[PDB]
Amino acid sequence: LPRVKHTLVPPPFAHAHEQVAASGPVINEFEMRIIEKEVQLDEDAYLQAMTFDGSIPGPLMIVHEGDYVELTLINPPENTMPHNIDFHAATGALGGGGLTLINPGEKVVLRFKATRAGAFVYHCAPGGPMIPWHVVSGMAGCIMVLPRDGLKDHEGKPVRYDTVYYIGESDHYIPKDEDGTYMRFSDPSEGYEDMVAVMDTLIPSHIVFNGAVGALTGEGALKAKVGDNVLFVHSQPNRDSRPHLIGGHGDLVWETGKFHNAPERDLETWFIRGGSAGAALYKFLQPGVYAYVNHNLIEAVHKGATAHVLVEGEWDNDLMEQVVAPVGL
Amino acid sequence: LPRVKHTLVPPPFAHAHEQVAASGPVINEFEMRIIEKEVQLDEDAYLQAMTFDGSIPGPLMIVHEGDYVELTLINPPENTMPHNIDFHAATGALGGGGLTLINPGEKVVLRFKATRAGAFVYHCAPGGPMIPWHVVSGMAGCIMVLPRDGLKDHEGKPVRYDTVYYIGESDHYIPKDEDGTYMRFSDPSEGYEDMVAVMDTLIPSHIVFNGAVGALTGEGALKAKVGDNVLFVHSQPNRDSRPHLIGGHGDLVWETGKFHNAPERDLETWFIRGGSAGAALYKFLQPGVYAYVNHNLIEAVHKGATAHVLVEGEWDNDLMEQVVAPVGL
Amino acid sequence: LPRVKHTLVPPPFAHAHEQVAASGPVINEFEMRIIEKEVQLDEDAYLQAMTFDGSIPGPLMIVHEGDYVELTLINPPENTMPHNIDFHAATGALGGGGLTLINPGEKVVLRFKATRAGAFVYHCAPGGPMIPWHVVSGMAGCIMVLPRDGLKDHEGKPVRYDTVYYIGESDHYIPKDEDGTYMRFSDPSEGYEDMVAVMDTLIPSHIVFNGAVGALTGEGALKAKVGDNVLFVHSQPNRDSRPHLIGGHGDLVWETGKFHNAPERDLETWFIRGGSAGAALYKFLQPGVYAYVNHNLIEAVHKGATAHVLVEGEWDNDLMEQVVAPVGL
Ligand SMILES: [Cu+2]
Ligand SMILES: [Cu+2]
Ligand SMILES: [Cu+2]
Ligand SMILES: [Cu+2]
Ligand SMILES: [Cu+2]
Ligand SMILES: [Cu+2]
Numbered sequence: 001l002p003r004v005k006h007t008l009v010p011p012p013f014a015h016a017h018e019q020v021a022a023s024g025p026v027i028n029e030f031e032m033r034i035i036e037k038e039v040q041l042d043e044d045a046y047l048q049a050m051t052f053d054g055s056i057p058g059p060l061m062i063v064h065e066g067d068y069v070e071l072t073l074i075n076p077p078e079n080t081m082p083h084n085i086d087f088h089a090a091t092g093a094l095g096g097g098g099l100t101l102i103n104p105g106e107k108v109v110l111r112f113k114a115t116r117a118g119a120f121v122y123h124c125a126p127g128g129p130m131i132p133w134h135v136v137s138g139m140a141g142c143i144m145v146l147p148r149d150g151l152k153d154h155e156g157k158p159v160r161y162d163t164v165y166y167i168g169e170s171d172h173y174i175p176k177d178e179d180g181t182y183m184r185f186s187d188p189s190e191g192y193e194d195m196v197a198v199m200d201t202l203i204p205s206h207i208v209f210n211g212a213v214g215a216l217t218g219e220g221a222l223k224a225k226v227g228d229n230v231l232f233v234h235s236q237p238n239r240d241s242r243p244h245l246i247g248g249h250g251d252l253v254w255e256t257g258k259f260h261n262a263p264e265r266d267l268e269t270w271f272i273r274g275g276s277a278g279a280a281l282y283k284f285l286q287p288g289v290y291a292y293v294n295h296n297l298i299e300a301v302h303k304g305a306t307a308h309v310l311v312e313g314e315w316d317n318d319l320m321e322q323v324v325a326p327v328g329l
Numbered sequence: 330l331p332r333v334k335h336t337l338v339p340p341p342f343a344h345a346h347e348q349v350a351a352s353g354p355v356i357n358e359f360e361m362r363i364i365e366k367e368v369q370l371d372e373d374a375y376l377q378a379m380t381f382d383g384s385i386p387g388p389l390m391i392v393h394e395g396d397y398v399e400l401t402l403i404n405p406p407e408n409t410m411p412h413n414i415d416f417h418a419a420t421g422a423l424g425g426g427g428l429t430l431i432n433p434g435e436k437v438v439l440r441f442k443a444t445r446a447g448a449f450v451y452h453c454a455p456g457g458p459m460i461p462w463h464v465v466s467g468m469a470g471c472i473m474v475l476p477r478d479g480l481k482d483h484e485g486k487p488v489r490y491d492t493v494y495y496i497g498e499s500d501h502y503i504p505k506d507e508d509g510t511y512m513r514f515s516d517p518s519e520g521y522e523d524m525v526a527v528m529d530t531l532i533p534s535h536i537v538f539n540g541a542v543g544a545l546t547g548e549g550a551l552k553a554k555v556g557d558n559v560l561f562v563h564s565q566p567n568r569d570s571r572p573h574l575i576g577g578h579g580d581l582v583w584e585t586g587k588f589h590n591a592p593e594r595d596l597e598t599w600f601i602r603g604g605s606a607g608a609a610l611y612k613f614l615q616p617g618v619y620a621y622v623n624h625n626l627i628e629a630v631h632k633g634a635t636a637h638v639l640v641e642g643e644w645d646n647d648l649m650e651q652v653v654a655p656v657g658l
Numbered sequence: 659l660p661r662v663k664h665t666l667v668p669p670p671f672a673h674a675h676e677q678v679a680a681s682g683p684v685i686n687e688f689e690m691r692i693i694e695k696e697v698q699l700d701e702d703a704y705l706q707a708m709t710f711d712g713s714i715p716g717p718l719m720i721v722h723e724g725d726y727v728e729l730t731l732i733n734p735p736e737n738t739m740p741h742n743i744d745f746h747a748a749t750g751a752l753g754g755g756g757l758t759l760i761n762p763g764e765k766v767v768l769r770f771k772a773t774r775a776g777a778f779v780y781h782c783a784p785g786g787p788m789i790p791w792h793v794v795s796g797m798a799g800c801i802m803v804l805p806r807d808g809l810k811d812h813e814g815k816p817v818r819y820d821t822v823y824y825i826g827e828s829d830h831y832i833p834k835d836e837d838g839t840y841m842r843f844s845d846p847s848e849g850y851e852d853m854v855a856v857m858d859t860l861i862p863s864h865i866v867f868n869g870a871v872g873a874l875t876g877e878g879a880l881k882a883k884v885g886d887n888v889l890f891v892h893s894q895p896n897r898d899s900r901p902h903l904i905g906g907h908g909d910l911v912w913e914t915g916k917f918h919n920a921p922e923r924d925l926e927t928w929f930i931r932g933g934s935a936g937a938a939l940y941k942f943l944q945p946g947v948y949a950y951v952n953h954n955l956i957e958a959v960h961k962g963a964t965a966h967v968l969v970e971g972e973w974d975n976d977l978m979e980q981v982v983a984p985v986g987l
Binding site for chain 3: 597599600624627649653657
Binding site: 203240242244248249264265267269270271285289291296297298300301302315316318319320322323324326327328329 | 399403406417419420422423425426428430436437438439441442445450461464465529530531566568585587603606
């Protein structure tokens with residue numbers, strides 16, 4: 001088959017790709033490097049992270065149904081842990097986990113066939129209690145497998161997006177020193193038992209988009225124009241989320257994230273099941289600031305699950321009008 | 330366009346409306362008054378509430394796809410907080426939130442076009458940490474936007490209900506004095522920091538239908554007759570729910586609440602995502618007492634999420650028979 | 659009508675049945691015996707269980723749409739509690755709960771008509787706070803009502819499984835002595851108030867498949883061959899779950915569990931709402947060990963929600979290949 005190398009782009013952006021397959025089935029070559037480092041989640045909150053390619057989430061890989069994926073996965077000798085990769089996109093051997101367990105100072109090359117259209121989680125799954133821990137330390141990302149024929153809608157007609165953003169949501173369980181401030185550690189394995197106690201409560205301390213509170217606000221703010229049709233790909237590897245575009249809708253929404261299923265239309269809020277990725281297409285009609293949230297508003301605001309979209313274009317007063325500005329009684 | 334004033338009815342009832350639009354697109358005029366007051370949730374549990382029109386949930390507004398909604402929202406000078414309104418039904422400016430921030434002693438008139446069929450949450454969203462707090466103090470309600478053509482079923486055939494009930498479910502985070510009894514405060518802003526600590530645990534103290542434990546039982550019991558086709562509209566602005574009609578089913582169910590999507594049929598239990606509203610139609614076949622619950626039974630029973638329906642009519646022994654009454658071994 | 663006695667098989671197995679109804683509507687006779695006993699959940703964790711037929715979950719009953727179900731339910735005099743049964747499959751009288759409340763030393767015979775196709779929860783529901791408590795002590799199981807015509811797929815074409823496994827997931831709230839070890843009691847009613855405090859936190863101590871941590875691993879490991887089409891029926895009577903077959907997919911999935919609704923296809927992870935049962939069909943393509951998990955990985959690994967499937971057959975390298983084994987850098 002033809003082979004194609006890919007240069008990965010950190011999220012929320014996506015490496016170049018076609019929607020409808022230009023050619024026939026190819027072998028997609030990706031490479032990633034595992035990086036264990038301490039990341040900042042908030043004003044005063046840090047995480048002993050473990051990443052695919054330095055980012056939470058790991059980067060978006062894009063392919064077409066029928067392609068193959070050949071990934072060189074590498075674990076640099078400065079890392080303290082073994083790691084692997086389970087693609088929910090793949091069939092066999094625990095999604096590839098049973099063939100990619102590599103130690104600090106090793107590499108592995110896995111190939112699988114993308115038989116199934118949709119967005120899918122990939123995450124590290126070293127075995128036993130290492131599974132939850134590596135994932136809640138950030139080791140998860142997404143792979144989107146587009147139908148060859150491009151995206152189809154509910155009645156089977158083509159739909160094309162102008163922009164895909166990859167929203168990687170992730171829940172984290174930072175333990176606290178006695179003083180009620182968040183603990184810091186020199187390495188992950190040092191933080192282990194304290195993180196466990198927090199995990200067993202099933203209450204996350206943080207829940208963030210693209211790695212940290214406010215990561216997709218401020219200079220990280222997502223961008224678009226009125227008339228833009230944007231695909232929002234949203235992953236949650238360990239815990240449910242309920243995405244909502246404040247001031248918008250999901251025009252077409254595959255909440256279970258698999259493109260040969262009919263999308264739902266006109267959604268206020270949709271549902272991403274822990275261990276999955278979903279996709280919502282929206283065409284912006286109104287300019288201005290939007291928020292993209294997890295709509296448990298405690299999770300959106302106290303925990304970190306809020307992104308911003310800045311949209312320019314022409315205001316349409318038909319859709320919305322302030323008839324009487326805030327005047328006194 | 331023709332304009333129509335509406336007099337709102339507190340939930341679980343609904344102001345008069347037609348299913349299929351009598352006329353063409355009109356401008357629907359609603360008015361609401363924000364009321365900050367202390368409400369009773371349980372035997373010994375109170376909440377520094379903040380309401381649309383004095384009720385939790387805020388009242389149901391009904392319109393047709395293509396109409397406009399013009400709401401006069403009013404914040405009386407005895408209220409201590411600014412407030413606004415975000416309709417998930419609306420497009421632009423944070424669902425209208427960015428155009429309706431009014432202080433104690435002001436009003437605003439917002440118009441938007443109901444472009445999209447379904448039931449939708451509206452809630453107050455003052456900005457930042459005010460967003461979760463105002464919502465978990467009761468400031469949320471629903472607006473149902475019926476297709477002009479009335480309700481259609483899965484194969485496109487019309488369906489009509491004889492009764493709509495609006496079930497507003499709401500989660501609340503009442504803090505506790507040291508003695509393990511629920512705290513009371515003289516105003517909301519006095520209760521703030523104590524409520525926050527509870528909110529950060531993501532465990533609600535109460536979860537209620539129409540404002541309080543047992544609010545839709547006893548004299549609040551919902552009512553119907555065998556042969557009645559009842560639409561149950563159910564909102565949860567901040568947290569997931571799994572509604573179930575004990576002794577019944579959901580005949581046709583839009584769990585994501587948007588009417589141009591095919592309903593599911595024969596459901597034992599459905600799923601309302603936090604930040605959304607859903608709708609289930611049921612035709613009563615058996616008379617007697619039913620319970621409508623959130624089917625995490627700890628939430629239904631220990632937290633407040635239980636309503637009753639009292640149904641009269643003829644018992645059909647074909648569907649269910651006690652063959653041998655409780656006799657000894 | 660013809661009558662048919664059934665001998666129940668404990669889960670995850672299923673009594674013999676046909677997929678497409680051999681004959682016309684019959685009266686299905688089942689009998690169950692309530693057993694209150696202490697069960698082991700983990701290495702050092704026990705539960706004052708209350709069961710249908712000695713097992714968690716209660717056994718799978720299978721019938722066809724249009725049949726009747728006549729169950730003799732029996733509560734032996736050594737039991738300390740009254741109990742009943744609510745079938746979500748049934749119509750009227752709180753799913754049969756209002757006609758089957760029997761004391762220690764009594765029996766009852768209930769008949770209902772299975773008007774509705776799908777898998778459905780049945781659980782004990784004695785009234786008030788007894789409802790959550792009996793269910794979180796294990797009193798719940800499932801009844802699957804197959805269409806007469808057998809299983810149909812999304813385009814209406816027949817689908818047949820070679821094996822049904824019944825995965826009964828269940829959440830439990832074991833209290834702790836002061837020393838942080840799990841409490842033990844001599845009877846259920848002795849454990850009551852301590853279990854309540856845990857329940858009110860809505861954090862389960864355990865979440866298990868077929869009764870106990872590791873119950874469906876080791877010698878309990880589920881089994882199949884490449885080319886086997888397996889139906890996985892999955893119930894959660896009180897709390898949401900997100901099932902995922904590690905290394906596999908859900909080929910056709912009724913996550914709300916009702917067979918006259920179109921299934922979804924190609925799912926990585928699906929969603930079982932508390933108070934319901936779902937069904938996923940998968941055709942094994944790759945041999946080896948798979949895990950079937952609740953994909954909140956903290957629930958899967960720290961809490962007990964993990965099963966194993968052992969699959970033999972021929973490895974297909976097209977689907978997955980280890981191109982370069984774990985070699986050094
Ligand atoms: Cu890892
Ligand atoms: Cu996984
Ligand atoms: Cu407010
Ligand atoms: Cu909202
Ligand atoms: Cu019982
Ligand atoms: Cu139930």
